Design a protein around this ligand. Structure first.
Ligand code: HEM
Length: 82
């Protein structure tokens, strides 16, 4: 079963030492990619600990980027927060 994380817990992972993000209700820990993102680290920090779905789609990420995203998954957003 997937683990659920609350928005309350996810918001605590909002800096360079630990960055989590929600994208389409899936929760990712991208801390280790913060310095390797082709779009740079600052745009990730700007939305660290939050739902970045809209920004991820608006930028227009490639299929390869979406396959890479799967490698950072840790769970899904708790339903009380959906
Ligand atoms: C945490 C999951 C994310 C992953 C795995 C990811 C991955 C990537 C990859 C692989 C690229 C290279 C081009 C491509 O393949 O599309 C890229 C480019 C980029 N990303 Fe992300 N990204 C993520 C989140 C974001 C977020 C949240 C933002 C917005 C704040 C963002 C903004 C950008 C920008 C501006 C570029 C470069 C411009 C572009 O080529 O149009 N990315 N990202």
């Amino acid at each position: 079963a997937v683990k659920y994380y609350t928005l309350e817990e996810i918001q605590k992972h909002n800096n360079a030492k630990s960055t989590w993000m929600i994208i389409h209700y899936k929760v990712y820990d991208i801390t280790r990619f913060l310095s390797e993102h082709p779009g740079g680290e600052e745009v990730l920090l700007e939305q660290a600990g939050a739902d970045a779905t809209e920004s991820f789609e608006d930028v227009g990420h490639s299929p390869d980027a979406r396959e890479m995203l799967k490698t950072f998954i840790i769970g899904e957003l708790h339903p009380d927060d959906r």
